[PDB]
Protein backbone atom coordinates (compact mmCIF):
# COMPACT_ATOMS: atom_id res chain seq x y z
CA UNK A 1 0.00 0.00 0.00
CA UNK A 2 3.00 2.28 -0.72
CA UNK A 3 0.83 4.23 -3.20
CA UNK A 4 -1.82 4.95 -0.51
CA UNK A 5 -0.23 4.85 2.96
CA UNK A 6 3.04 6.65 2.10
CA UNK A 7 3.58 10.33 1.29
CA UNK A 8 6.55 12.67 0.64
CA UNK A 9 7.95 13.55 4.11
CA UNK A 10 6.67 10.38 5.84
CA UNK A 11 3.23 9.20 6.94
CA UNK A 12 3.17 8.74 10.73
CA UNK A 13 -0.59 8.11 11.15
CA UNK A 14 0.07 4.35 11.49
CA UNK A 15 1.33 3.25 14.94
CA UNK A 16 2.54 0.08 16.66
CA UNK A 17 2.87 -0.86 20.34
CA UNK A 18 6.57 -0.99 21.27
CA UNK A 19 6.32 -1.94 24.96
CA UNK A 20 4.00 -4.16 27.01
CA UNK A 21 4.18 -5.84 30.44
CA UNK A 22 3.21 -9.21 28.83
CA UNK A 23 2.60 -10.85 25.43
CA UNK A 24 -0.90 -10.64 23.94
CA UNK A 25 -3.32 -13.58 23.97
CA UNK A 26 -4.68 -14.70 20.54
CA UNK A 27 -7.07 -12.05 19.13
CA UNK A 28 -6.46 -9.80 22.14
CA UNK A 29 -6.74 -6.07 21.42
CA UNK A 30 -4.82 -3.59 23.59
CA UNK A 31 -5.47 0.09 22.80
CA UNK A 32 -4.21 1.48 26.18
CA UNK A 33 -1.79 4.47 26.19
CA UNK A 34 -0.58 3.94 29.82
CA UNK A 35 3.07 5.06 30.33
CA UNK A 36 5.26 1.94 30.35
CA UNK A 37 7.17 1.51 33.64
CA UNK A 38 10.53 0.11 32.37
CA UNK A 39 12.12 0.48 35.86
CA UNK A 40 11.20 0.22 39.57
CA UNK A 41 9.97 3.87 39.84
CA UNK A 42 6.19 4.38 39.32
CA UNK A 43 5.56 6.83 36.42
CA UNK A 44 2.08 7.99 37.65
CA UNK A 45 1.28 8.89 33.99
CA UNK A 46 4.49 11.01 33.73
CA UNK A 47 7.09 10.20 31.03
CA UNK A 48 10.84 10.34 31.74
CA UNK A 49 13.66 7.99 32.83
CA UNK A 50 12.33 4.38 32.52
CA UNK A 51 8.90 5.95 31.70
CA UNK A 52 8.13 5.69 27.95
CA UNK A 53 5.00 6.03 25.76
CA UNK A 54 3.98 2.47 24.68
CA UNK A 55 3.28 3.37 21.02
CA UNK A 56 5.49 4.55 18.13
CA UNK A 57 4.85 5.72 14.54
CA UNK A 58 5.82 4.03 11.29
CA UNK A 59 8.07 5.91 8.86
CA UNK A 60 6.19 5.44 5.57
CA UNK A 61 7.87 7.35 2.73
CA UNK A 62 7.42 6.41 -1.00
CA UNK A 63 11.23 6.05 -1.23
CA UNK A 64 11.38 3.52 1.66
CA UNK A 65 12.67 -0.03 1.17
CA UNK A 66 10.02 -2.65 0.32
CA UNK A 67 10.69 -4.06 3.82
CA UNK A 68 9.73 -0.68 5.34
CA UNK A 69 6.96 0.12 2.83
CA UNK A 70 3.33 -0.01 4.12
CA UNK A 71 1.31 -3.21 3.66
CA UNK A 72 -2.46 -3.52 4.20
CA UNK A 73 -3.40 -6.78 5.94
CA UNK A 74 -6.75 -8.55 6.27
CA UNK A 75 -7.02 -11.66 8.45
CA UNK A 76 -10.05 -13.87 7.90
CA UNK A 77 -10.98 -16.14 10.81
CA UNK A 78 -13.62 -18.82 10.23
CA UNK A 79 -15.90 -19.79 13.10
CA UNK A 80 -18.27 -22.71 13.64
CA UNK A 81 -20.47 -22.01 16.74
CA UNK A 82 -23.34 -23.66 18.65
CA UNK A 83 -25.49 -22.04 15.86
CA UNK A 84 -26.45 -22.41 12.14
CA UNK A 85 -23.79 -21.68 9.54
CA UNK A 86 -24.82 -18.41 7.88
CA UNK A 87 -21.68 -17.73 5.83
CA UNK A 88 -21.66 -20.05 2.84
CA UNK A 89 -19.77 -20.34 -0.43
CA UNK A 90 -21.28 -19.61 -3.89
CA UNK A 91 -21.72 -23.37 -4.58
CA UNK A 92 -25.20 -23.85 -6.07
CA UNK A 93 -27.68 -26.15 -4.29
CA UNK A 94 -29.51 -29.07 -5.91
CA UNK A 95 -32.68 -31.16 -5.54
CA UNK A 96 -32.89 -33.74 -2.73
CA UNK A 97 -33.08 -37.50 -3.46
CA UNK A 98 -34.19 -40.07 -0.88
CA UNK A 99 -33.75 -43.85 -0.50
CA UNK A 100 -30.66 -43.93 -2.75
CA UNK A 101 -26.91 -44.18 -2.21
CA UNK A 102 -25.74 -40.60 -2.76
CA UNK A 103 -22.82 -38.28 -2.17
CA UNK A 104 -24.43 -35.62 0.05
CA UNK A 105 -23.14 -32.20 1.15
CA UNK A 106 -25.09 -30.31 3.84
CA UNK A 107 -23.51 -26.93 4.57
CA UNK A 108 -20.02 -28.39 3.87
CA UNK A 109 -20.78 -31.54 5.90
CA UNK A 110 -19.94 -34.12 3.28
CA UNK A 111 -20.58 -37.85 3.23
CA UNK A 112 -21.97 -40.81 1.34
CA UNK A 113 -25.13 -42.64 2.38
CA UNK A 114 -28.86 -43.24 2.02
CA UNK A 115 -31.06 -40.36 3.17
CA UNK A 116 -34.40 -41.43 4.63
CA UNK A 117 -37.36 -39.77 6.35
CA UNK A 118 -36.42 -39.88 10.04
CA UNK A 119 -38.60 -40.36 13.12
CA UNK A 120 -36.05 -38.56 15.34
CA UNK A 121 -37.22 -35.57 17.42
CA UNK A 122 -34.60 -32.85 17.00
CA UNK A 123 -35.00 -29.78 19.19
CA UNK A 124 -35.64 -26.42 17.42
CA UNK A 125 -31.90 -25.65 17.68
CA UNK A 126 -30.44 -29.09 16.83
CA UNK A 127 -28.85 -29.19 13.39
CA UNK A 128 -27.40 -32.68 13.01
CA UNK A 129 -27.24 -35.89 15.02
CA UNK A 130 -24.21 -38.08 15.63
CA UNK A 131 -23.57 -41.78 16.17
CA UNK A 132 -21.48 -43.38 18.92
CA UNK A 133 -18.61 -43.33 16.40
CA UNK A 134 -18.79 -39.48 16.24
CA UNK A 135 -20.17 -39.84 12.70
CA UNK A 136 -23.22 -37.98 11.36
CA UNK A 137 -26.30 -40.19 11.70
CA UNK A 138 -29.02 -37.64 10.91
CA UNK A 139 -29.19 -34.08 9.59
CA UNK A 140 -31.59 -31.18 9.27
CA UNK A 141 -31.91 -29.98 5.66
CA UNK A 142 -30.77 -26.30 5.56
CA UNK A 143 -33.57 -25.40 3.08
CA UNK A 144 -36.31 -27.50 4.70
CA UNK A 145 -36.56 -27.95 8.45
Amino acid at each position, epitope marked *: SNNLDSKVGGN*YNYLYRLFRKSNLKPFERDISTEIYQAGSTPCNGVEGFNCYFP*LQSY*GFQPTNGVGYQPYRVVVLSFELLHAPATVCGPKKSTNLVKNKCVNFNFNGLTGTGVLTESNKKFLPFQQFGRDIADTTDAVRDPQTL
Partner: nanobody
Amino acid sequence: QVQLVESGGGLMQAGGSLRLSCAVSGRTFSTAAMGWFRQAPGKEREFVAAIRWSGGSAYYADSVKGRFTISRDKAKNTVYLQMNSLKYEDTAVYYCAGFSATRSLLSDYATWPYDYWGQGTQVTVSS
Protein backbone atom coordinates in the same frame (compact mmCIF):
# COMPACT_ATOMS: atom_id res chain seq x y z
CA GLN B 1 -5.38 22.18 5.52
CA VAL B 2 -3.80 22.76 8.95
CA GLN B 3 -2.53 26.09 10.35
CA LEU B 4 -0.38 27.11 13.34
CA VAL B 5 -0.77 30.84 14.25
CA GLU B 6 1.37 32.32 17.12
CA SER B 7 0.60 35.36 19.28
CA GLY B 8 1.95 36.99 22.45
CA GLY B 9 5.43 38.19 21.36
CA GLY B 10 6.74 41.60 22.43
CA LEU B 11 9.27 43.70 24.36
CA MET B 12 10.09 42.81 27.98
CA GLN B 13 12.80 43.75 30.50
CA ALA B 14 15.08 40.94 31.73
CA GLY B 15 13.62 39.06 34.72
CA GLY B 16 10.04 39.57 33.47
CA SER B 17 7.49 37.26 31.81
CA LEU B 18 5.79 36.62 28.44
CA ARG B 19 3.21 34.01 27.38
CA LEU B 20 3.20 32.88 23.72
CA SER B 21 0.13 31.08 22.26
CA CYS B 22 -0.10 28.95 19.11
CA ALA B 23 -3.62 28.15 17.86
CA VAL B 24 -4.05 25.00 15.75
CA SER B 25 -6.78 24.59 13.12
CA GLY B 26 -7.36 21.68 10.69
CA ARG B 27 -6.32 18.74 12.93
CA THR B 28 -5.15 17.47 16.35
CA PHE B 29 -1.72 15.98 17.28
CA SER B 30 -3.44 13.27 19.41
CA THR B 31 -0.68 10.76 20.39
CA ALA B 32 2.07 13.01 18.95
CA ALA B 33 3.41 16.38 20.10
CA MET B 34 3.81 20.14 19.65
CA GLY B 35 7.04 22.10 20.12
CA TRP B 36 8.56 25.56 20.41
CA PHE B 37 11.66 26.57 18.44
CA ARG B 38 13.46 29.94 18.26
CA GLN B 39 15.82 31.56 15.77
CA ALA B 40 17.99 34.52 16.79
CA PRO B 41 19.10 36.69 13.78
CA GLY B 42 22.03 34.95 12.02
CA LYS B 43 21.95 32.05 14.52
CA GLU B 44 20.82 28.45 13.86
CA ARG B 45 17.26 27.36 14.80
CA GLU B 46 17.18 26.06 18.40
CA PHE B 47 14.78 23.60 20.09
CA VAL B 48 13.12 25.18 23.19
CA ALA B 49 10.35 22.85 24.49
CA ALA B 50 8.03 20.01 23.41
CA ILE B 51 4.78 18.66 24.90
CA ARG B 52 2.95 15.39 24.21
CA TRP B 53 -0.63 16.23 23.22
CA SER B 54 -2.31 13.25 24.90
CA GLY B 55 -0.50 13.06 28.26
CA GLY B 56 0.93 16.60 28.58
CA SER B 57 4.46 15.45 29.52
CA ALA B 58 7.05 18.12 28.65
CA TYR B 59 10.68 18.10 27.46
CA TYR B 60 12.90 21.21 27.71
CA ALA B 61 16.24 22.40 26.32
CA ASP B 62 18.82 22.92 29.12
CA SER B 63 18.94 26.68 28.35
CA VAL B 64 15.29 27.18 29.45
CA LYS B 65 14.67 24.30 31.91
CA GLY B 66 13.06 25.62 35.12
CA ARG B 67 12.36 29.05 33.59
CA PHE B 68 10.02 28.23 30.67
CA THR B 69 6.82 26.17 30.99
CA ILE B 70 5.00 24.55 28.06
CA SER B 71 1.29 23.74 28.45
CA ARG B 72 -1.60 22.88 26.14
CA ASP B 73 -5.40 23.23 26.21
CA LYS B 74 -7.01 20.43 24.13
CA ALA B 75 -10.45 22.14 24.11
CA LYS B 76 -8.95 25.31 22.52
CA ASN B 77 -6.39 23.31 20.41
CA THR B 78 -3.75 25.77 21.69
CA VAL B 79 -0.18 25.31 23.03
CA TYR B 80 1.35 27.94 25.35
CA LEU B 81 4.93 28.89 26.19
CA GLN B 82 5.24 30.63 29.56
CA MET B 83 8.58 32.49 29.40
CA ASN B 84 9.60 33.35 32.99
CA SER B 85 12.91 34.91 34.13
CA LEU B 86 13.57 36.32 30.62
CA LYS B 87 17.24 36.93 29.74
CA TYR B 88 18.99 38.90 26.97
CA GLU B 89 19.80 35.83 24.78
CA ASP B 90 16.15 34.72 24.88
CA THR B 91 15.79 37.43 22.17
CA ALA B 92 14.64 35.55 19.02
CA VAL B 93 11.76 34.77 16.65
CA TYR B 94 9.74 32.00 18.37
CA TYR B 95 7.69 29.56 16.27
CA CYS B 96 5.45 26.67 17.28
CA ALA B 97 5.79 23.27 15.53
CA GLY B 98 3.63 20.18 14.96
CA PHE B 99 4.98 16.62 14.76
CA SER B 100 2.73 14.07 13.03
CA ALA B 101 5.15 11.39 14.31
CA THR B 102 4.29 9.71 17.63
CA ARG B 103 7.69 8.80 19.11
CA SER B 104 7.79 6.49 22.16
CA LEU B 105 10.58 8.56 23.73
CA LEU B 106 9.75 12.22 24.44
CA SER B 107 13.39 13.31 24.04
CA ASP B 108 13.21 12.48 20.30
CA TYR B 109 11.10 15.63 19.78
CA ALA B 110 14.25 17.70 20.46
CA THR B 111 15.80 16.58 17.13
CA TRP B 112 12.88 15.20 15.06
CA PRO B 113 12.12 17.32 11.94
CA TYR B 114 8.66 18.88 12.39
CA ASP B 115 6.08 18.78 9.56
CA TYR B 116 4.14 21.91 10.66
CA TRP B 117 5.21 25.41 11.76
CA GLY B 118 3.54 28.78 12.31
CA GLN B 119 4.72 32.21 11.13
CA GLY B 120 6.85 33.14 14.18
CA THR B 121 6.45 35.87 16.82
CA GLN B 122 9.31 38.22 17.84
CA VAL B 123 10.45 38.27 21.49
CA THR B 124 12.85 41.09 22.46
CA VAL B 125 14.43 41.25 25.95
CA SER B 126 15.61 44.71 27.19
CA SER B 127 18.61 44.90 29.59
